[PDB]
Design a binder for this molecule. Structure first.
Ligand SMILES: [Cl-]
Ligand SMILES: [Cl-]
Ligand SMILES: [Cl-]
Ligand SMILES: [Cl-]
Ligand SMILES: [Co+2]
Ligand SMILES: [Co+2]
Ligand SMILES: [K+]
Ligand SMILES: [K+]
Lengths: 112, 112
């Protein structure tokens, strides 16, 4: 699948009042990081489209654009999962098992 | 976005009767290849979920599962685009510009 793992967690197992206060800095830093990597992904998609518009074949331009797309997609996947673990660190310990249930099930479905 | 590039092309710019005959072998070979890589992707998602169920932290198990997911996703992206170029080769030349319009626009939106 193509689930939004971060959104799934904040909606299904929302932070409590104190957890939200504790996590606010890291949540903002993540929002900014997600936006930056998504800007890079959109730009890489544009480069791949441009390459194929110019010459619709495998090509050095296509090879480079494909790699750039892959790299940005991987950076987003990894950054998201690191932030998911940041969230888990900021939870009261007793809230972690419910969080994990949602996380495990969503990962199995391909959410990222 | 998360568009299904292959499906977008076959639906918006379907093959004509003769093109469909010419392409049938390569279309079948691609269907089988897509299914194989998707099996690997689902299995990699399962390994990542398992890893995090066991120990919800970055870990050698998470590192390996994440890489396996990335590798299968890239293999699928590349195989799809190679087959898109197979399709273009099997088109009557006069049909290629319409195909390219759909392809370029869909790539720009992130379809893969
Ligand atoms: Cl929340
Ligand atoms: Cl809990
Ligand atoms: Cl078709
Ligand atoms: Cl045309
Ligand atoms: Co968060
Ligand atoms: Co096809
Ligand atoms: K993930
Ligand atoms: K692509």
């Amino acid at each position: 699948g193509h689930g939004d793992l971060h959104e799934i967690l904040h909606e299904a197992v929302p932070l409590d009042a104190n957890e939200r206060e504790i996590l606010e800095l890291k949540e903002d830093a993540f929002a900014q990081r997600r936006r930056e990597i998504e800007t890079r992904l959109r730009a890489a998609n544009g480069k791949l489209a441009d390459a194929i518009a110019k010459n619709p074949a495998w090509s050095p331009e296509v090879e480079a654009a494909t790699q750039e797309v892959e790299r940005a997609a991987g950076d987003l996947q990894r950054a998201t999962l690191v932030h998911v673990f940041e969230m888990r660190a900021g939870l009261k310990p007793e809230h972690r098992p419910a969080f994990d249930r949602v996380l495990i099930d969503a990962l199995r479905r391909g959410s990222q």
